[PDB]
Coordinates of C-alpha atoms and ligand atoms in Angstrom, one line a residue:
Chain A
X1 CA 0.0 0.0 0.0
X2 CA 1.8 3.1 -1.3
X3 CA 0.0 6.4 -0.8
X4 CA 1.7 9.2 -2.6
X5 CA 1.4 12.7 -1.2
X6 CA 2.7 16.2 -2.0
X7 CA 5.0 18.3 0.2
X8 CA 5.3 22.1 -0.3
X9 CA 8.0 23.3 2.0
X10 CA 9.2 27.0 1.8
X11 CA 13.0 27.4 1.5
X12 CA 14.2 27.8 5.1
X13 CA 11.7 25.5 6.8
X14 CA 14.4 23.3 8.2
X15 CA 12.9 22.4 11.6
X16 CA 9.5 22.1 9.9
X17 CA 10.8 19.5 7.5
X18 CA 12.8 17.8 10.2
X19 CA 9.6 17.5 12.2
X20 CA 7.9 16.3 9.0
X21 CA 10.5 13.5 8.7
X22 CA 10.3 12.4 12.4
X23 CA 6.5 12.2 11.9
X24 CA 7.0 9.9 8.9
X25 CA 9.0 7.6 11.2
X26 CA 6.8 7.7 14.3
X27 CA 3.6 7.0 12.3
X28 CA 4.9 4.5 9.9
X29 CA 2.9 1.2 9.7
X30 CA 3.0 -2.0 7.7
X31 CA -0.6 -1.5 6.6
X32 CA 0.5 1.3 4.3
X33 CA 3.4 3.7 3.7
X34 CA 3.3 7.4 2.8
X35 CA 5.5 8.6 -0.1
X36 CA 6.3 12.3 0.3
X37 CA 7.2 14.2 -2.9
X38 CA 9.0 17.3 -1.6
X39 CA 9.1 20.5 -3.5
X40 CA 11.1 23.4 -2.1
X41 CA 9.8 26.7 -3.6
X42 CA 9.4 30.3 -2.6
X43 CA 6.0 30.1 -0.9
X44 CA 5.4 33.8 -1.5
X45 CA 5.6 33.5 -5.3
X46 CA 2.0 32.7 -6.5
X47 CA 3.2 31.5 -9.9
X48 CA 5.7 29.0 -8.4
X49 CA 3.1 27.7 -6.0
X50 CA 0.8 27.1 -9.0
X51 CA 3.4 24.9 -10.7
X52 CA 4.3 23.0 -7.6
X53 CA 0.6 22.2 -7.2
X54 CA -0.1 21.1 -10.8
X55 CA 3.2 19.2 -10.7
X56 CA 2.2 17.2 -7.6
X57 CA -1.3 16.9 -9.2
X58 CA 0.0 15.4 -12.4
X59 CA 2.2 13.0 -10.4
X60 CA -1.2 11.8 -9.0
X61 CA -1.2 12.5 -5.3
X62 CA -4.0 11.8 -2.9
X63 CA -3.3 14.7 -0.6
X64 CA -1.0 17.7 -0.3
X65 CA 0.8 19.1 2.8
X66 CA 2.4 22.5 2.6
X67 CA 2.4 26.2 3.5
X68 CA 1.0 29.4 2.0
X69 CA 1.6 33.1 2.3
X70 CA -0.9 36.0 2.5
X71 CA -0.3 36.2 -1.3
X72 CA -0.4 32.6 -2.4
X73 CA -3.1 31.5 0.0
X74 CA -5.8 32.3 -2.5
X75 CA -4.2 30.1 -5.2
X76 CA -4.2 27.0 -2.9
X77 CA -7.7 27.4 -1.5
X78 CA -9.0 27.9 -5.1
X79 CA -7.3 25.0 -6.9
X80 CA -7.8 22.6 -4.0
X81 CA -11.5 23.5 -4.1
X82 CA -11.8 23.1 -7.8
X83 CA -9.8 19.9 -8.2
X84 CA -11.2 18.5 -5.0
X85 CA -7.6 18.0 -3.7
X86 CA -7.1 18.0 0.1
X87 CA -4.5 20.5 1.5
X88 CA -3.2 20.2 5.0
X89 CA -1.3 23.2 6.3
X90 CA 0.1 24.5 9.6
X91 CA 0.0 28.0 8.2
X92 CA -2.5 30.7 9.4
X93 CA -6.2 29.8 9.2
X94 CA -8.1 30.9 6.1
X95 CA -10.3 34.0 6.4
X96 CA -13.6 32.2 5.6
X97 CA -14.9 28.7 4.8
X98 CA -12.7 27.2 2.1
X99 CA -13.4 23.4 1.5
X100 CA -10.7 20.8 0.9
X101 CA -8.3 22.6 3.3
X102 CA -7.1 21.2 6.7
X103 CA -5.7 23.9 9.0
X104 CA -3.4 22.8 11.9
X105 CA -3.2 26.2 13.4
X106 CA -6.0 27.1 15.8
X107 CA -7.6 30.5 15.7
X108 CA -5.8 32.9 18.2
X109 CA -8.2 35.7 17.5
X110 CA -10.5 34.5 20.4
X111 CA -7.7 33.9 22.9
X112 CA -6.3 37.3 22.3
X113 CA -9.5 39.3 22.8
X114 CA -10.2 37.3 26.0
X115 CA -6.7 38.1 27.4
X116 CA -7.2 41.9 26.8
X117 CA -10.3 41.9 28.9
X118 CA -8.6 39.9 31.6
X119 CA -5.9 42.6 32.1
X120 CA -8.8 45.1 31.6
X121 CA -7.1 47.1 28.8
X122 CA -8.9 50.2 27.4
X123 CA -6.0 51.9 25.6
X124 CA -3.2 49.9 24.0
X125 CA -0.9 49.9 21.0
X126 CA -1.2 47.2 18.4
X127 CA 1.9 46.6 16.3
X128 CA 0.9 44.1 13.6
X129 CA 2.5 42.4 10.6
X130 CA 0.6 41.9 7.4
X131 CA 2.3 38.5 6.8
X132 CA -0.5 36.4 8.4
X133 CA -3.3 38.6 7.2
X134 CA -5.1 41.4 9.0
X135 CA -7.6 38.9 10.3
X136 CA -6.6 39.6 13.9
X137 CA -6.3 43.3 13.2
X138 CA -9.9 43.5 12.1
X139 CA -10.8 41.5 15.2
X140 CA -9.3 44.0 17.7
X141 CA -10.6 47.0 15.7
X142 CA -14.1 45.7 15.5
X143 CA -14.1 44.8 19.2
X144 CA -12.6 48.3 19.9
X145 CA -16.0 49.7 18.7
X146 CA -18.1 47.5 21.1
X147 CA -15.8 47.2 24.1
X148 CA -14.8 50.9 23.5
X149 CA -11.0 50.7 23.2
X150 CA -8.5 53.3 22.0
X151 CA -6.3 51.1 19.8
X152 CA -3.2 52.5 18.1
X153 CA -2.7 50.1 15.2
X154 CA 0.7 50.4 13.5
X155 CA 1.9 48.3 10.5
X156 CA 5.4 47.3 11.7
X157 CA 5.8 45.1 8.6
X158 CA 6.7 47.4 5.7
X159 CA 9.8 48.5 7.6
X160 CA 12.8 48.3 5.3
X161 CA 15.4 46.3 7.2
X162 CA 18.6 47.9 5.7
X163 CA 18.1 51.1 7.7
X164 CA 15.4 50.1 10.2
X165 CA 16.3 52.3 13.2
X166 CA 15.2 55.8 12.4
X167 CA 11.9 54.1 11.9
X168 CA 11.7 52.5 15.3
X169 CA 12.8 55.7 17.0
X170 CA 10.0 57.5 15.1
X171 CA 7.7 54.5 16.0
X172 CA 8.0 54.9 19.8
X173 CA 7.9 58.6 19.3
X174 CA 4.2 58.3 18.4
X175 CA 3.7 55.7 21.1
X176 CA 4.8 58.5 23.5
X177 CA 2.3 61.2 22.5
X178 CA -0.3 59.1 24.3
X179 CA 2.3 57.6 26.7
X180 CA 1.5 54.1 25.5
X181 CA 2.7 51.6 28.1
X182 CA 0.7 48.6 26.8
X183 CA 1.8 47.1 23.5
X184 CA 0.5 44.0 21.6
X185 CA 3.1 42.4 19.3
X186 CA 1.3 40.5 16.5
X187 CA 4.3 39.3 14.5
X188 CA 6.3 36.2 13.6
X189 CA 8.9 34.7 15.8
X190 CA 11.5 36.7 14.0
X191 CA 9.9 40.2 13.8
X192 CA 9.2 39.8 17.5
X193 CA 12.9 39.4 18.5
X194 CA 13.7 42.5 16.4
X195 CA 11.2 44.5 18.3
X196 CA 12.1 43.1 21.6
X197 CA 15.8 44.0 21.0
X198 CA 14.8 47.5 20.0
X199 CA 12.6 47.8 23.1
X200 CA 15.5 46.9 25.4
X201 CA 17.8 49.3 23.6
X202 CA 15.5 52.3 24.1
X203 CA 14.9 51.0 27.6
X204 CA 11.1 50.5 27.3
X205 CA 11.3 47.1 28.9
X206 CA 11.3 48.3 32.5
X207 CA 8.5 48.2 35.0
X208 CA 5.5 50.0 33.8
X209 CA 5.3 48.5 30.3
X210 CA 3.2 45.5 29.4
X211 CA 3.7 43.4 26.2
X212 CA 1.6 40.7 24.7
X213 CA 3.1 38.4 22.1
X214 CA 0.2 37.6 19.7
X215 CA 1.4 34.2 18.5
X216 CA 1.1 30.5 19.4
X217 CA 4.8 30.3 20.2
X218 CA 5.5 32.3 23.4
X219 CA 8.4 30.2 24.5
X220 CA 9.6 29.8 20.9
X221 CA 11.5 33.1 21.0
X222 CA 14.3 34.4 23.3
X223 CA 12.8 35.9 26.5
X224 CA 15.9 35.8 28.7
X225 CA 16.5 39.4 27.4
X226 CA 13.3 41.1 28.4
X227 CA 12.9 38.7 31.4
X228 CA 14.7 40.7 34.0
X229 CA 13.8 44.1 32.5
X230 CA 10.8 44.6 34.7
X231 CA 8.1 45.0 32.1
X232 CA 5.4 42.3 32.2
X233 CA 5.3 40.1 29.2
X234 CA 2.4 37.8 28.3
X235 CA 1.7 35.4 25.4
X236 CA 0.2 32.2 24.2
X237 CA 1.6 28.6 24.1
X238 CA 0.1 25.8 22.0
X239 CA 2.8 23.2 22.7
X240 CA 2.4 22.2 26.4
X241 CA 5.7 20.9 27.5
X242 CA 4.0 19.6 30.6
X243 CA 2.1 16.9 28.7
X244 CA 3.8 13.5 29.1
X245 CA 3.0 13.1 25.4
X246 CA 5.1 16.2 24.4
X247 CA 7.6 15.5 27.2
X248 CA 8.3 12.1 25.6
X249 CA 8.6 13.7 22.1
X250 CA 11.3 16.1 23.3
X251 CA 13.2 13.3 25.0
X252 CA 13.9 11.9 21.5
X253 CA 13.8 15.2 19.6
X254 CA 16.5 16.9 21.8
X255 CA 18.8 13.9 21.2
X256 CA 18.5 13.7 17.4
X257 CA 21.6 14.5 15.3
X258 CA 21.5 18.1 14.2
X259 CA 23.4 17.1 11.1
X260 CA 20.7 15.0 9.6
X261 CA 17.9 16.8 11.3
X262 CA 18.6 20.6 11.0
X263 CA 17.6 22.7 14.0
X264 CA 16.3 19.6 15.9
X265 CA 18.9 19.4 18.7
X266 CA 16.9 21.5 21.2
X267 CA 14.6 21.0 24.2
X268 CA 11.9 23.2 22.5
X269 CA 10.1 23.3 19.2
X270 CA 8.5 26.0 17.1
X271 CA 4.7 25.7 17.0
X272 CA 4.8 25.6 13.2
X273 CA 7.1 22.6 13.4
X274 CA 5.0 20.9 16.1
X275 CA 1.9 21.3 13.9
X276 CA 3.8 19.7 11.0
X277 CA 4.5 16.7 13.1
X278 CA 0.8 16.6 14.2
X279 CA -0.1 16.9 10.5
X280 CA 1.5 13.6 9.6
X281 CA -0.4 11.9 12.4
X282 CA -3.7 13.3 11.0
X283 CA -2.9 12.2 7.5
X284 CA -2.1 8.7 8.8
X285 CA -5.2 8.3 10.8
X286 CA -7.2 9.6 7.9
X287 CA -5.9 7.1 5.3
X288 CA -6.2 4.4 7.9
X289 CA -9.9 5.1 8.5
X290 CA -10.4 4.7 4.8
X291 CA -8.9 1.2 4.7
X292 CA -10.9 0.0 7.7
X293 CA -14.0 1.6 6.1
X294 CA -13.6 -0.5 2.9
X295 CA -13.4 2.6 0.7
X296 CA -11.5 2.3 -2.6
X297 CA -9.9 5.6 -3.7
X298 CA -6.7 4.4 -5.4
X299 CA -5.5 5.7 -8.8
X300 CA -2.4 6.2 -10.9
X301 CA -0.1 9.1 -11.9
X302 CA -2.3 10.1 -14.8
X303 CA -4.8 12.6 -13.3
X304 CA -3.7 14.7 -16.2
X305 CA -2.9 18.4 -16.5
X306 CA -4.5 20.5 -13.8
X307 CA -5.4 23.2 -16.3
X308 CA -7.6 20.7 -18.1
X309 CA -10.7 22.3 -19.4
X310 CA -13.3 21.5 -18.5
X311 CA -11.7 20.6 -15.2
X312 CA -13.3 17.4 -13.8
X313 CA -12.8 16.7 -10.1
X314 CA -12.1 13.0 -9.2
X315 CA -14.8 11.7 -6.9
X316 CA -12.3 9.9 -4.8
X317 CA -11.3 13.2 -3.4
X318 CA -14.6 13.8 -1.6
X319 CA -13.9 10.8 0.6
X320 CA -10.4 11.8 1.4
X321 CA -11.7 15.1 2.8
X322 CA -14.4 13.4 4.9
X323 CA -11.6 11.3 6.3
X324 CA -9.1 14.0 7.3
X325 CA -11.9 16.1 8.8
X326 CA -13.2 13.1 10.7
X327 CA -9.8 12.4 12.3
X328 CA -9.5 13.0 16.1
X329 CA -6.3 12.1 17.8
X330 CA -4.0 13.5 20.5
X331 CA -0.9 15.4 19.5
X332 CA 1.7 17.9 20.6
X333 CA -0.9 20.7 20.1
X334 CA -3.4 19.2 22.5
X335 CA -6.7 17.5 21.4
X336 CA -7.0 17.6 17.6
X337 CA -10.5 17.9 16.1
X338 CA -12.0 19.5 13.0
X339 CA -15.4 20.8 11.7
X340 CA -17.0 20.4 8.3
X341 CA -14.8 23.2 7.0
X342 CA -11.3 22.3 8.3
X343 CA -10.9 24.8 11.2
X344 CA -9.8 23.1 14.4
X345 CA -12.2 22.9 17.3
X346 CA -12.3 21.7 20.9
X347 CA -8.7 22.9 21.4
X348 CA -6.8 24.5 24.2
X349 CA -4.5 27.5 24.3
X350 CA -2.5 28.1 27.4
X351 CA -2.1 31.7 28.6
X352 CA 1.4 32.5 29.6
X353 CA 3.1 35.1 31.7
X354 CA 6.8 35.9 32.0
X355 CA 8.0 36.0 35.6
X356 CA 11.5 36.2 37.2
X357 CA 12.0 32.5 37.3
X358 CA 10.8 32.2 33.7
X359 CA 7.5 31.6 31.7
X360 CA 4.6 30.3 33.7
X361 CA 1.1 29.1 32.7
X362 CA -1.6 31.2 34.4
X363 CA -4.5 29.5 32.7
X364 CA -5.9 28.3 29.4
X365 CA -8.5 29.3 26.8
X366 CA -11.3 27.1 25.5
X367 CA -13.5 27.9 22.5
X368 CA -16.4 27.1 24.7
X369 CA -15.2 28.2 28.2
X370 CA -13.2 31.3 27.2
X371 CA -10.4 32.0 29.6
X372 CA -10.0 29.9 32.7
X373 CA -7.3 30.6 35.3
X374 CA -5.4 27.8 37.0
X375 CA -3.7 27.6 40.4
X376 CA -0.7 30.0 40.7
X377 CA -2.0 32.9 42.9
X378 CA 0.9 33.9 45.1
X379 CA -1.7 34.0 47.9
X380 CA -1.3 36.1 49.9
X381 CA 0.1 39.6 49.8
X382 CA 1.1 40.7 53.3
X383 CA -2.7 40.6 53.9
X384 CA -1.7 40.2 57.5
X385 CA -3.4 43.4 58.4
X386 CA -3.3 45.0 61.9
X387 CA -5.9 44.3 64.6
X388 CA -6.8 47.6 66.2
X389 CA -8.6 47.3 69.5
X390 CA -10.8 50.2 70.8
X391 CA -13.6 51.0 73.3
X392 CA -17.0 52.4 72.6
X393 CA -16.8 55.9 74.1
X394 CA -18.3 59.0 72.7
Chain B
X1 CA -7.2 29.2 -16.9
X2 CA -8.5 32.3 -18.7
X3 CA -5.0 33.7 -18.6
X4 CA -3.2 30.5 -19.9
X5 CA -6.0 30.2 -22.5
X6 CA -5.5 33.7 -23.8
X7 CA -1.8 33.0 -23.6
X8 CA -1.9 29.9 -25.7
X9 CA -4.0 31.8 -28.3
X10 CA -1.0 34.0 -28.5
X11 CA -2.1 37.4 -27.4
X12 CA 0.1 40.5 -27.3
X13 CA -1.6 42.1 -24.3
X14 CA -4.4 41.4 -21.8
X15 CA -7.1 43.7 -20.5
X16 CA -9.2 42.6 -17.6
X17 CA -10.1 42.9 -13.9
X18 CA -9.0 41.2 -10.7
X19 CA -10.2 40.8 -7.1
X20 CA -8.4 41.0 -3.8
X21 CA -8.1 37.3 -4.1
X22 CA -7.1 36.8 -7.8
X23 CA -4.9 39.9 -8.0
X24 CA -1.8 37.9 -6.9
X25 CA -2.3 35.4 -9.7
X26 CA -2.4 38.0 -12.4
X27 CA 0.6 40.1 -11.1
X28 CA 2.6 36.9 -10.8
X29 CA 1.9 35.3 -14.2
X30 CA 2.1 38.5 -16.1
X31 CA 5.5 39.1 -14.5
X32 CA 6.9 35.7 -15.2
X33 CA 5.6 35.4 -18.8
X34 CA 6.3 39.1 -19.5
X35 CA 2.7 39.6 -20.5
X36 CA 1.2 43.1 -20.2
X37 CA -2.0 43.4 -18.2
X38 CA -4.1 46.5 -18.4
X39 CA -6.8 46.9 -15.7
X40 CA -9.2 49.5 -14.4
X41 CA -9.3 47.7 -11.0
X42 CA -7.7 48.9 -7.8
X43 CA -4.0 49.7 -7.9
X44 CA -1.6 46.9 -6.8
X45 CA -0.1 47.3 -3.3
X46 CA 3.5 47.5 -4.5
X47 CA 5.6 47.6 -7.7
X48 CA 4.5 44.8 -10.0
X49 CA 5.9 44.9 -13.5
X50 CA 3.9 44.2 -16.6
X51 CA 0.8 45.7 -15.1
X52 CA -1.0 48.9 -16.3
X53 CA -3.4 50.4 -13.8
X54 CA -6.1 52.8 -15.0
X55 CA -7.3 53.7 -11.6
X56 CA -5.3 56.5 -9.8
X57 CA -4.4 56.1 -6.2
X58 CA -7.1 57.7 -4.0
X59 CA -5.2 57.2 -0.8
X60 CA -3.6 60.6 -1.2
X61 CA -6.7 62.6 -2.1
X62 CA -8.6 61.1 0.9
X63 CA -5.9 62.0 3.5
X64 CA -5.8 65.5 2.1
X65 CA -9.6 65.9 2.4
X66 CA -9.6 64.8 6.0
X67 CA -7.1 67.6 7.0
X68 CA -9.1 70.1 5.0
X69 CA -12.2 69.5 7.1
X70 CA -9.9 69.3 10.1
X71 CA -11.1 65.9 11.3
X72 CA -9.6 64.5 14.5
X73 CA -12.2 61.8 15.4
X74 CA -14.1 59.9 12.7
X75 CA -15.6 56.5 11.9
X76 CA -14.1 54.6 9.0
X77 CA -16.4 52.0 7.5
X78 CA -14.4 49.9 5.0
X79 CA -14.8 47.0 2.6
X80 CA -12.1 44.4 2.2
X81 CA -13.0 44.1 -1.5
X82 CA -10.4 46.6 -2.8
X83 CA -7.7 45.6 -0.2
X84 CA -7.0 47.3 3.1
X85 CA -4.5 49.6 1.3
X86 CA -6.5 52.7 2.2
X87 CA -7.3 51.4 5.6
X88 CA -3.6 51.1 6.5
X89 CA -3.2 54.6 5.1
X90 CA -5.6 56.3 7.5
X91 CA -4.5 54.1 10.4
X92 CA -0.8 54.9 9.9
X93 CA -1.6 58.6 9.4
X94 CA -3.8 58.4 12.6
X95 CA -0.6 57.8 14.5
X96 CA 1.2 60.9 13.1
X97 CA -1.7 63.3 12.7
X98 CA -3.1 61.9 16.0
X99 CA -6.6 60.8 15.0
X100 CA -9.1 58.7 16.8
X101 CA -10.3 56.4 14.0
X102 CA -13.0 53.9 14.5
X103 CA -12.4 51.3 11.8
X104 CA -15.3 48.9 11.1
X105 CA -15.3 46.1 8.5
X106 CA -18.7 46.6 6.9
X107 CA -17.9 44.0 4.4
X108 CA -18.4 40.6 6.0
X109 CA -22.1 41.5 6.7
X110 CA -24.3 38.7 5.6
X111 CA -27.0 40.2 3.3
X112 CA -29.8 37.8 4.1
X113 CA -30.5 39.3 7.5
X114 CA -28.3 42.5 7.4
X115 CA -30.4 44.8 9.6
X116 CA -29.7 43.7 13.2
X117 CA -26.1 44.3 12.2
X118 CA -26.5 47.9 11.1
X119 CA -28.5 48.7 14.2
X120 CA -25.7 47.3 16.2
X121 CA -23.3 49.1 14.0
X122 CA -24.5 52.6 14.7
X123 CA -25.0 51.6 18.3
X124 CA -21.2 51.5 18.6
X125 CA -21.0 54.7 16.6
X126 CA -23.1 56.3 19.3
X127 CA -20.9 55.4 22.3
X128 CA -18.6 58.1 21.1
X129 CA -21.3 60.1 19.3
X130 CA -19.6 59.7 15.9
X131 CA -21.0 62.3 13.5
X132 CA -18.3 62.0 10.9
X133 CA -18.2 58.8 8.8
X134 CA -16.0 57.8 5.9
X135 CA -17.5 55.2 3.5
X136 CA -14.8 53.2 1.7
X137 CA -17.0 50.9 -0.3
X138 CA -18.1 50.0 -3.8
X139 CA -20.9 51.9 -5.6
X140 CA -23.3 49.2 -4.4
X141 CA -22.3 48.8 -0.7
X142 CA -22.5 52.6 -0.5
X143 CA -26.2 52.7 -1.5
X144 CA -27.0 50.0 1.0
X145 CA -25.4 52.1 3.8
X146 CA -26.9 55.4 2.5
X147 CA -30.3 53.8 2.6
Chain C
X1 CA 25.1 44.3 33.6
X2 CA 23.9 47.8 33.9
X3 CA 21.9 47.5 30.7
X4 CA 20.5 44.2 31.8
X5 CA 19.1 45.5 35.1
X6 CA 18.0 48.6 33.2
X7 CA 20.1 51.1 35.3
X8 CA 21.2 52.8 32.1
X9 CA 18.1 55.0 31.6
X10 CA 17.7 58.7 32.2
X11 CA 18.6 59.5 35.8
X12 CA 21.9 57.7 36.1
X13 CA 25.3 59.2 35.5
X14 CA 28.4 57.1 34.9
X15 CA 32.1 58.2 34.8
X16 CA 34.6 55.9 33.1
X17 CA 37.8 56.5 35.1
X18 CA 40.3 55.6 32.5
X19 CA 42.3 57.3 29.6
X20 CA 40.4 55.2 27.1
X21 CA 36.8 56.4 26.9
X22 CA 36.4 55.6 23.3
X23 CA 38.4 52.4 23.6
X24 CA 35.3 50.5 24.8
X25 CA 32.0 49.8 23.3
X26 CA 29.6 52.6 24.0
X27 CA 26.9 52.0 21.4
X28 CA 25.1 49.9 24.0
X29 CA 24.7 52.5 26.8
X30 CA 24.5 55.3 24.2
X31 CA 20.8 55.3 23.6
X32 CA 19.8 54.2 27.1
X33 CA 19.4 57.7 28.4
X34 CA 21.9 57.7 31.2
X35 CA 24.6 60.3 30.8
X36 CA 28.1 58.8 30.4
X37 CA 31.3 60.7 30.8
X38 CA 35.0 59.8 30.7
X39 CA 38.5 60.7 29.6
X40 CA 40.4 60.5 26.3
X41 CA 44.1 60.8 25.9
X42 CA 44.3 59.9 22.2
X43 CA 42.8 62.9 20.4
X44 CA 41.7 61.6 17.0
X45 CA 41.2 65.2 15.9
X46 CA 44.9 65.9 15.8
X47 CA 46.3 65.7 12.3
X48 CA 49.2 63.8 13.8
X49 CA 46.9 61.0 15.2
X50 CA 44.6 61.2 12.2
Ligands
NAG1 C1 -13.6 17.4 23.4 O1 -12.2 17.5 23.8 C2 -12.0 16.9 25.1 C3 -10.5 17.2 25.5 O2 -9.6 16.5 24.6 C4 -12.2 15.4 25.0 O3 -12.0 14.8 26.2 C5 -13.7 15.2 24.6 O4 -13.9 13.8 24.3 C6 -14.0 16.0 23.3 N1 -15.5 16.0 23.2 C7 -16.1 15.2 22.2 C8 -17.6 15.0 22.4 O5 -15.5 14.7 21.3

């Protein structure tokens, strides 16, 4: 049983591919083997993505795992919908209901808005990056109307990096007109470190400031720098290293040879990579539920040209979708479940705060229970008041 | 398909339209295949070669008009159809010129029950007693709002 | 260490008691805010040194 699948990995996704390989090994069975056809292309380039898709389609694949950018996302969602091809991706969730797309990344929009109310914020700065779509930006802006917030949104993305200093100085110059002390960083693991470094340089990392890293990888970045500064830093973590499941994964991951497995000799793992590993498990359980369900879907490498007109969708694809979307297993990113569209449901996102001793989970966020705080209260706080005795005498 | 079809037919230039979703496809192919693409649609957010845009950039004219009326606090109802290029414009300028902009995506409003949404829309535009609104929409979405 | 604990912001004043003020890296505590003074024996403004 040889199931051929496509793999679209953006140049530079070393740890992601390394995690993709480890998944192939951990979830390899005798019942059937997955044959990944890897294609390293510039994910941003829409044209290239189109070729890589039609190429993997002519090779006759049953499913495709890859990534997309804010620019190429429309290409994938469109083709996969027309050709009834299933596309599994750890990338940011699609802004809508696009069929034949499985998204490993849970929606953070909800967890973010809940955290803001927890700290009871009414006026804050929102530094965003247009890389993962303004889906979360619209979220905070729309909620700013209802909850009545004074949000200062600033696109920290289009900043040219070969002279990006007179821009940051002019950035926190506007964030001083209103004396902004509460900032939300909605950026990638990289753009965050750049900002964090600048923050320390200008000294805006001392007590009084409060930063919120708007990503699923709070511990993915270096925090040792703004850890002793004084400013409170909060964020979100999807990979709970306290789970015996994840703890066991790291035990083998941290030992792997960094030569064969690039950027894999660490005690931690980027949430993007962790989702890639969980993606393999989903594809395995999906193709397995098709064998046990007595469903024939097999074909050959003659699907033909994807530009074929009229384009006829192979009916066997409809079943492959109902398989992946029906999958429900336990992975590094907590309980994995899907709806009819492909968006993850019944998941859990741990809310993190950065203390002196390091990061610490102060609670979690459920799509049905909102935010729920867990034990951690430093009870008490010198509450030991003073007992004053007195007599009733006018 | 329509692009590759017209390309196989051996054309010298292509005139058409694109959406916020298909725009990347056109700009990419036309750049790779060195095919010229003339379009009246919204200008591309960047410098994409082999693309001729008939529509001038309104971003500039809008910002200038705001200062003319001397606006400091206004509501900005936008539609994600023509890209948030102008939205980013007013938001970025809101930092410099110090404006209190209330941006609201009036696009994702489902039209088969779009009434309890408008009532809840001007309910938020009443918390701050917004009297100055900017409608960044198509000729159609504008009439709906105006009505 | 000063930068780490954040004692390099406005309000602090350091004096480097050596003849090599520009000999060390100052780009780090340069934008901090705290005033830093010192001593220089090698004048790079002299045509001789230049
Ligand atoms: C929802 O998720 C929880 C936590 O993983 C799980 O225990 C439960 O079975 C799920 N609910 C259903 C009905 O699938």
